[PDB]
Amino acid sequence: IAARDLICAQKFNGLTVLPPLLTDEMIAQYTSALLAGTITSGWTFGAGAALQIPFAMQMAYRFNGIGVTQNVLYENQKLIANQFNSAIGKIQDSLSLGKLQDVVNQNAQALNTLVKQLSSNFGAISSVLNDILSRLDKVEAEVQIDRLITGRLQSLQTYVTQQLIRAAEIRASANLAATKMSECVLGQSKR
Amino acid sequence: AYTNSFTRGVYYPDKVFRSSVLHSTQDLFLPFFSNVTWFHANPVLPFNDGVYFASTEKSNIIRGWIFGTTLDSKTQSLLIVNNNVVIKVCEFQFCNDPFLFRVYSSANNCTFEYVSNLREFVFKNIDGYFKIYSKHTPIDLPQGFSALEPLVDLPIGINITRFQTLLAAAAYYVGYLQPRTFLLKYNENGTITDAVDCALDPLSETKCTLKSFTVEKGIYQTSNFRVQPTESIVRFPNITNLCPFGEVFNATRFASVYAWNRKRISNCVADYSVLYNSASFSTFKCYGVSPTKLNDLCFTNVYADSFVIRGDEVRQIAPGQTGKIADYNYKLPDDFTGCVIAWNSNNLDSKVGGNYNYLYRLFRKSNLKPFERDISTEIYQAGSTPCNGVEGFNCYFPLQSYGFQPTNGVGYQPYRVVVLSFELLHAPATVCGPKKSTNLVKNKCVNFNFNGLTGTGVLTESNKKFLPFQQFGRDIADTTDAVRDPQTLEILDITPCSFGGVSVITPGTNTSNQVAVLYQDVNCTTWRVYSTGSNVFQTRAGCLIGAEHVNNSYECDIPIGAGICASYQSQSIIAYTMSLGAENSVAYSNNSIAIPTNFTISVTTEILPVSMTKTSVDCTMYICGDSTECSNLLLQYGSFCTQLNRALTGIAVEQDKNTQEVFAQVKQIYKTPPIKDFGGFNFSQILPDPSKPSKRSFIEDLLFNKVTLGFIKQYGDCLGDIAARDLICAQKFNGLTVLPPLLTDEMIAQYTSALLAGTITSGWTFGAGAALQIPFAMQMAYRFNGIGVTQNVLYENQKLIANQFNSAIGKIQDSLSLGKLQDVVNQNAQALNTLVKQLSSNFGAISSVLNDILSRLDKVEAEVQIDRLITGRLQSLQTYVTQQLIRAAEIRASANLAATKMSECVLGQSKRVDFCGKGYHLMSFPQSAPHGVVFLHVTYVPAQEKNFTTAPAICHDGKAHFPREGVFVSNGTHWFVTQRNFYEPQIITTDNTFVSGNCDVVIGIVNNTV
Amino acid sequence: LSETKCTLKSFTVEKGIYQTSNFRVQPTESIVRFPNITNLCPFGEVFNATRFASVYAWNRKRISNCVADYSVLYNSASFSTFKCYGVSPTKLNDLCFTNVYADSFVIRGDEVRQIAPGQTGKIADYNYKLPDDFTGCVIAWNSNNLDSKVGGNYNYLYRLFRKSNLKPFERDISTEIYQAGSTPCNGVEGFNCYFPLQSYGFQPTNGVGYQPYRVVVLSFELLHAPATVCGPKKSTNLVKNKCVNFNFNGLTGTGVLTESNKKFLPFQQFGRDIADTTDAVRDPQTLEILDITPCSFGGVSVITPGTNTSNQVAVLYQDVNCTTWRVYSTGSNVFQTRAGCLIGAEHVNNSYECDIPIGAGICASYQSQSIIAYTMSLGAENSVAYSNNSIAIPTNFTISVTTEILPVSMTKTSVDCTMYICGD
Amino acid sequence: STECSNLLLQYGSFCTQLNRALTGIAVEQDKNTQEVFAQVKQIYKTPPI
Ligand SMILES: CCCCC/C=C\C/C=C\CCCCCCCC(=O)O
Ligand SMILES: CCCCC/C=C\C/C=C\CCCCCCCC(=O)O
Ligand SMILES: *[C@@H]1O[C@H](CO)[C@@H](O)[C@H](O)[C@H]1NC(C)=O
Ligand SMILES: *[C@@H]1O[C@H](CO)[C@@H](O)[C@H](O)[C@H]1NC(C)=O
Ligand SMILES: *[C@@H]1O[C@H](CO)[C@@H](O)[C@H](O)[C@H]1NC(C)=O
Ligand SMILES: *[C@@H]1O[C@H](CO)[C@@H](O)[C@H](O)[C@H]1NC(C)=O
Ligand SMILES: *[C@@H]1O[C@H](CO)[C@@H](O)[C@H](O)[C@H]1NC(C)=O
Ligand SMILES: *[C@@H]1O[C@H](CO)[C@@H](O)[C@H](O)[C@H]1NC(C)=O
Ligand SMILES: *[C@@H]1O[C@H](CO)[C@@H](O)[C@H](O)[C@H]1NC(C)=O
Ligand SMILES: *[C@@H]1O[C@H](CO)[C@@H](O)[C@H](O)[C@H]1NC(C)=O
Ligand SMILES: *[C@@H]1O[C@H](CO)[C@@H](O)[C@H](O)[C@H]1NC(C)=O
Ligand SMILES: *[C@@H]1O[C@H](CO)[C@@H](O)[C@H](O)[C@H]1NC(C)=O
Ligand SMILES: *[C@@H]1O[C@H](CO)[C@@H](O)[C@H](O)[C@H]1NC(C)=O
Ligand SMILES: *[C@@H]1O[C@H](CO)[C@@H](O)[C@H](O)[C@H]1NC(C)=O
């Protein structure tokens, strides 16, 4: 069963995956707290104590924010609510995400090619240590084992360098997402 | 009968002086915390790989030792005895009870002779050398750490498996040694004072990896779970006969070279030791295999080729030779695997008068191909004219005859030649060798040898169907994973027996010595662990052993994974689930609102790196030192140092650019105000202090002492032994240097003081051109208008606001008693230190010192080693440069963020949420720090809210009215209109209101009077 | 400037500052320090002995306190085999050797190929074996004139049967009968049992492959511990506080020798650092201990206005404090900064903007015409007339247009690896 | 293989380096998640009405 799993083929050769510290349920808990705060309090909770305010009055504030008078909202409340409900319905209808899948695909591909590069000779007489050691004595075997060692070390070094570059990219994206959460969800943006 | 050693038994591995260092070595050591045996006041004990001996005596009772295999007169034994120190190697005949001088009865021929309160000895036997280390120590085995020093090494050259003690009211101890890895500590004087056994505990593995005797609180990854092989297996086919050595090597008459003979070998056992008493070979050379492995292998397609040639043509039977025989008679491939055997036969093939029975080919149009035979007899044309049979002046008969007389020179004597060709380790094989098979063992980690293929692992029954011509099966990584048993013909799968990840959690060695272990691939709900215990907690990250579970939820202390953390509390380690935060709720309704009635002024600090250290490298000095030979060999890699230096120079200029674009935003320098009277606001703690050797403020001074880090280091400064501990001019004796920043710290402080003066005297006008003066209180009133509060609110609470600001700015300097800035320094130091440390690697050569290599080998033999060293060291430098580039990019991102923050938070008022602090931003002050910048953010925070009833609109007389600013609130009886961020009710009248409705459509309208 | 030109691989240089090689120093003279020994090594007793031992009971003797001048063998001894393993034959005259043993025996002509680290056969298996990590030399020569007698010399024996292979440098001198059929063999012989030892029959009229050969094996260690067997080199005086070339007991190198304060234990001769290079040594004659320091140290930089403007340059020595001789050349003007010592530029007292950055707040520029060094200026000095009842308000305005430039893309490339690496 | 394990010790300062880099990445990921999602330390209930 180890000859087809492709996961414990990785970890029979020393490659392992570590779990995240926060579980998906805890993340969903955080997002639910954010939604409850923004719906009940407006943008007050993002600056200290959360103050309650009726939702229609909050949307009137947000209309004053974009340069329209608040009586325009109160005279079209039902049309606005219907439009919002229909729009969210369309959003969930459409859902029947390649940016997120690309990261997973890249990580899997990197680990799999790392496993695959173990069949190279690197200039020796074979890529199997046991075959080399079954036929040659110590002095004649060091010369081949050293070539294999150098090849596999440079494989690992290449993998680590690529991982560092990808991590820097992901950090840039995470900083952008944090700023978006801070400025679009906890307040109204003018940019 | 049994005792415990703790840290007893350690010797100097080498004879080289070291001091102030930690060194890691592998040798045969007595394992830490092992059980030794106790003998009171003799028996015969084994001698496995070496012995640790100790004797606590008071009257010189222990006297000596005897070593050997059997202690009779059929083998040699070693006697060491005091009585005069006497050392002999003889064929002694010993007694059952030897005591001291009736120790032995006879002494046959000898090959070695030398007659000449806690005593510790170590004995070893390597390469015919009996090595002894010893030490004495004045005072139930005691405790402590002492290191034994080399005593003697004797060339006895005997085989030892047992030993015994010689006795004339004492005790002695016996422990056995195993190959281990130790981390020893040398002190200032060169004495070994401490050691760590790496293969004892996971904590010991962590200590050996960190190369330190202390560990800081955290969680560390250790080696994967390892399992040892229990036993060994041999499985060859069943064969009885012996290979036909007599028919090949003892044949009556051999063939001619031009018609060499070939025969196949199969179904036999290759036991060539039967040739030792009858055949001596002048040539025996093998190509694809070592001569010392032949007894362990099996061979697939075995052919033997025989012929006869003359004495000095034997050198032509080799893969790549030219000559008469190699060209026209017999050629070997370049990829030949086999053996060539030749021996002189002047007694059989020589006759008086001349033997003319052996021929060879002298003329041919073109060279043969490997293993091609040509037995033609057609005349040879050598003049480009017809050659129809007749001979002479153009035509020769191709074949010539050897003439072998008994009285020739050795170069013209007959030689018999055999060539054996075979294949190894790919297909089924019927010519095995003289090894004996054993039983087949399944479902255990064992050592196996299947038809010469050796390995380790677990064997299981398989379901694959090999074709008859296949014997092995390979995986995608090119390793064998299936095999066919050569006797039962069943097929087995081979699986490795090492699997699973392991981690160790520690609170710090300076706190406690207890640890927890996480097994990441185990479900205890279980035996794949080093040790079980009283408490075993199962998580979804693995199985944790050594920590107690609890049901309450704290914040995280040490992250373990999947929502579980650990901490240290009679005192134990506990595991819990991390809490996200407090549990709160909001009293929401459709006609209720809360409005603040008071406020607080808060000051918070933010820290950002701006720069890192600039370095340069002299590659010739790092790679070659000062060897002219190495310097001349390095020129064949010349296009690789300029590249590294270009990258480093780019980084070095980038750092100064970062500092310039963060701090030199204003080119006008504003002097500090001569009179400091700003509506009652105290700035003395952040303005420049002129009563110091610098112009740094109080807070800046507190900041600069909180980071531990430019200087001129002279040659005479660390000339001599002082270079062996500085750790800085150890770097720069190898070509690594640090360049100073272009702007000094005083200049940076000058820029920050100009910024503060501008912002305190001008507001935000100086960041857009000419700086215009304005009283500070009016500036604060403007900043209050900025966040949506009226300016009269500021003017009526000026004393309270000023007092709050002063107390808040005092709290910051109180608290200052910065790991983000220290991390950069630590990383930059560590990288260079490991670069210096990597110069002790061999990289595959015979030594890591150029001078040692060049003191013993000459040019041609020395290039082969110097080139390996050069490749390794170039790789080290390239790795360092790449990591530096990545870190520089990260620092550039941080510096750009700091520049934007200086431009938007300090030179103006920000509307972006949570960009210049927490709350509603008012204003910001920068301070300079080592390699970074610190921002003091001042924000407005509403407080002390109260409840009110609210309506969206008010209907007077059939018309709708809207507040036009703020909200309508009611305190139970009356209706007022107020502002959002501060309670300030007023009368609802026609100027604070506008009418744009008919009072028929607004939901929630409440009618009142205006 | 020439080093900069060679590094850039160009005959022109643009205005700026360039890093050059570190400050190098040449060694003045050479030193040799061996121990004091008078005697000559016993070549006659080993190579000229009347009778050697058998291969199964080979002989071994220790060599110490002598000088190895093997040129004395040229007059009398010709060798058919001489091979060395851990060292080159042309370096033997400059080295010292630590633990020297000589092992001697006699074998037949065609077995000499079996005295090597990884050989198989009768002698390598049952009689005499070498390690895989052997460091030493093997010497063999024909001796048909001494060990051959008419009718057959039967004094030399070897072992033909043994249960298992010998370990390296192991001797076996037993005489017990050998069991070859798995039946009791209590002394009697025949059809299952053999006496383990066989005898060479050496007659003068044999083939060269059946003639006697005398074999000596020398084993020693190099460059780790104290040594008493040295080559025929002559010592010189000890020189301190100068960069010299040294040869201490065969270990060669360069640097400065200084008196030390370390106490080696009697069994130690050298000392190492974390980098695994030798740092301390013990003089083999006075028994004092010296420290070895490299004599190359310090960074150097060159400031140039551009070769198309002028050929004159300034040099910054980054590890020198002229307030001074660790410089290539002195000059009329020398300026001391906290970045190093600058030689070839005139200091001035007025402050400009930066032109060429030097470090720690100092820049340089081209001024009859010379290079000048000053401290960069941060900008103009202004002030604000602040009071508690005053304000300034603009009365006019200006419209300004400014430019900003940003990169968006770079060039796209591809590679054919087979074409770059292997051509065709 | 014990032989390869004993031969690899002449390259011992190259595994710790790789592992340090990977550990840095691993902690960076958890930091990213915290700084994106755990912005508010107060947990608010979903409204009852
Ligand atoms: C009697 C023991 C002498 C050994 C002294 C110790 C080390 C000398 C090492 C190598 C020198 C080889 C000496 C044998 C003569 C070499 C052949 C020649 O003459 O060119
Ligand atoms: C005719 C039998 C063919 C040999 C069997 C096939 C393969 C065995 C390969 C090598 C071992 C035999 C080498 C000949 C003996 C020389 C070694 C010695 O005695 O010094
Ligand atoms: C050792 O002594 C025994 C007994 O006389 C003798 O047979 C044997 O040949 C001797 N061997 C050696 C090497 O001296
Ligand atoms: C070790 O060296 C120090 C100086 O480095 C010295 O003070 C101390 O006495 C020495 N220890 C001894 C001699 O035991
Ligand atoms: C060859 O045959 C002869 C005579 O039968 C025998 O004495 C000798 O030992 C044999 N040698 C080999 C190598 O078979
Ligand atoms: C094989 O035969 C062809 C034609 O008969 C000839 O040209 C060629 O030389 C031969 N090969 C060899 C190796 O002689
Ligand atoms: C070897 O013996 C076993 C019985 O122990 C038998 O099954 C097997 O067939 C024999 N060898 C081969 C190649 O079949
Ligand atoms: C562990 O084993 C138990 C018992 O079968 C099972 O319920 C559980 O799903 C397994 N996995 C974990 C993570 O506990
Ligand atoms: C607001 O808080 C301050 C304390 O900072 C207090 O002195 C003041 O009385 C409070 N105002 C009211 C109206 O309670
Ligand atoms: C400002 O604070 C300092 C620090 O305590 C204090 O000495 C000074 O008196 C304060 N300013 C005034 C005007 O009191
Ligand atoms: C407002 O009322 C809610 C419940 O109606 C209460 O929980 C809250 O504490 C009140 N506000 C204040 C400031 O007390
Ligand atoms: C509400 O306001 C009215 C009008 O100012 C006042 O008479 C009454 O006392 C207030 N009630 C409370 C609870 O403040
Ligand atoms: C307020 O509106 C209600 C609903 O039409 C009406 O009955 C009531 O009389 C109004 N109040 C006043 C004071 O006009
Ligand atoms: C061996 O001794 C003889 C006679 O004493 C002498 O002639 C010969 O030169 C010596 N050979 C050596 C010392 O190699």
Ligand SMILES: *[C@@H]1O[C@H](CO)[C@@H](O)[C@H](O)[C@H]1NC(C)=O
């Ligand atoms: C050493 O002695 C033991 C027991 O006497 C024996 O089994 C082993 O074969 C001997 N070693 C050698 C290399 O003969």
Ligand SMILES: *[C@@H]1O[C@H](CO)[C@@H](O)[C@H](O)[C@H]1NC(C)=O
């Ligand atoms: C060598 O001679 C010196 C005197 O020049 C003497 O001090 C020294 O002891 C001699 N050699 C040794 C090893 O002592």
Ligand SMILES: *[C@@H]1O[C@H](CO)[C@@H](O)[C@H](O)[C@H]1NC(C)=O
């Ligand atoms: C250079 O030497 C002078 C003379 O002693 C000394 O005052 C100064 O501190 C040293 N360092 C620098 C950077 O000038």
Ligand SMILES: *[C@@H]1O[C@H](CO)[C@@H](O)[C@H](O)[C@H]1NC(C)=O
């Ligand atoms: C303002 O500047 C313009 C020149 O751009 C000038 O023509 C105009 O007279 C100025 N206004 C006053 C009031 O001086």
